[PDB]
């Protein structure tokens, strides 16, 4: 019927002025563009079919051709950036926005999907979709008393498209658009569907990946407790974006970090810092490193939750990137901590793994470790116990590593190692 048509036949059917022949040719095009392997998007574009599809988007009296052309254009916009640009150049954005209010739910859902692709191309097309006025009808589609009355696929598509509207930087989405979207996004963040939750968390993570004002916009909506709850979820697709959002939030001010701590986030990190998935471990260690860069009371809350031994463990054995994040966490801890917190750090057994990591090839981690060791030595000086720390470092084999680094190619490593050896060894 409409299966395995040639682009020639599709073009002849769409060039006929018989709306039913046009409909069947458009369905054949949709079926070609929906094939698993190498859909012929470039050939369809070269045939000049995008303007015809966009015109078909406005055939209110023929809902089937609206649906077929919307699907075809969605799949074309899912290709390269040049093909999404081809779709946009045909005028598809306002037509899809007009279709958002279609009485046919499948047509509205397809329009949502297409706008999601277009906005997902990048920040320019994201802002252009916003300028054409998509947010208001999109949100109207979600203005229901209970989200559970909506079809699951429809709701997932709406959530994904909104997340794409929140995505990308340079520039970030317009502030007014973010404020207009956020309430619905929180409501979705409280939904029970795992995919909706994952996409909502990803959107919140996008919105929190920026200056402190952007983070404040999100945290004032009260999302942090729900984010922590989702941090404790069993589904990795939910935990990953929730952890990303929590990390972004703790990159902000001390009060936003304190909001994260007050919600009970630290109690989840014993599992996260031992999670079998390496990415979770790395992101959790980065989050901990940003939390140890906070106030001394926040470092003390890290201590009270028994998380210093977990940092020692990650420093002892983990993928090298997680170990680098842990070294950063240790250096921030030692930079901002009290003498008592630093001696507690040493009592947990940090010196030996911190020294074993001086074997690495990365220069920046070496500099970070040497800075942490200098801070720990300053604490030991204030206690008059420099010789005990030096004996510890010498027994570990760390003095060998430091004296070797005296001959390192980088200037800072050279000078830091020589300072340590001149002042304490």
């Amino acid at each position: 019927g409409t299966v395995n048509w040639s682009v020639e036949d599709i073009v002849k059917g769409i060039n006929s002025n018989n709306l039913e022949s046009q409909l069947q040719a458009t369905q054949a095009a949709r079926k070609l563009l929906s094939r698993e392997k190498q859909p012929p998007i470039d050939n369809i574009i070269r045939a000049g079919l995008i303007p015809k599809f966009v015109s078909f988007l406005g055939k209110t009296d023929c809902s089937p051709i609206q649906f077929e052309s919307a699907w075809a254009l969605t799949n074309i916009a899912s290709g390269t950036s040049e093909q999404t640009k081809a779709v946009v150049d045909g005028g598809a954005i306002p037509a899809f926005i007009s279709l958002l209010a279609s009485p046919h739910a499948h047509i509205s859902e397809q329009a949502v999907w297409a706008l999601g692709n277009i906005a997902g191309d990048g920040s320019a097309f994201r802002d252009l979709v916003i300028k054409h006025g998509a947010i208001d009808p999109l949100l109207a589609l979600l203005a229901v008393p209970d989200l559970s009355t909506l079809a699951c696929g429809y709701l997932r598509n709406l959530t994904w498209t909104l997340s794409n509207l929140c995505r990308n930087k340079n520039p970030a989405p317009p502030l007014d658009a973010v404020e207009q979207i956020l309430p619905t996004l929180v409501r979705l963040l409280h939904h029970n569907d795992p995919e909706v939750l994952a996409d909502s968390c990803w959107a919140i993570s996008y919105l929190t990946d920026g200056p402190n004002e952007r983070i404040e916009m999100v945290v004032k909506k009260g999302v942090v407790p729900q984010l922590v709850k989702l941090l404790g979820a069993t589904e990795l697709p939910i935990v990953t974006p929730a952890l990303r959002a929590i990390g972004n939030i703790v990159t902000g001010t001390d009060e936003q970090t304190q909001k994260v701590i007050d919600a009970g986030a630290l109690a989840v990190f014993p599992s996260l810092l031992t999670n079998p998935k390496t990415n979770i471990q790395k992101e959790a260690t980065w989050t901990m490193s940003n939390i140890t860069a906070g106030r001394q009371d926040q470092i003390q809350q890290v201590v009270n939750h028994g998380l210093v031994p977990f940092l020692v463990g990650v420093l002892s054995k983990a993928d090298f990137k997680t170990q680098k994040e842990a070294a950063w966490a240790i250096t921030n801890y030692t930079s901002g901590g009290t003498v008592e917190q630093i001696v507690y750090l040493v009592h947990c057994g940090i010196i030996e793994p911190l020294m074993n990591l001086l074997s690495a090839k990365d220069t920046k981690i070496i500099q970070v470790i040497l800075d942490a060791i200098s801070n720990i030595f300053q604490a030991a000086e204030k206690l008059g116990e420099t010789e005990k720390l030096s004996i510890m470092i010498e027994e570990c084999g760390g003095l060998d590593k430091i004296e070797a680094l005296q001959r390192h190619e980088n200037e800072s490593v050279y000078k830091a190692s020589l300072n340590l050896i001149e002042k304490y060894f």
Partner: peptide
Amino acid sequence: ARKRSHSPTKKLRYVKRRF
């Protein structure tokens, strides 16, 4: 000690095809 922001994503485009 300064807060260290997350590294930029290398996934610049997020688009989906309907099969």
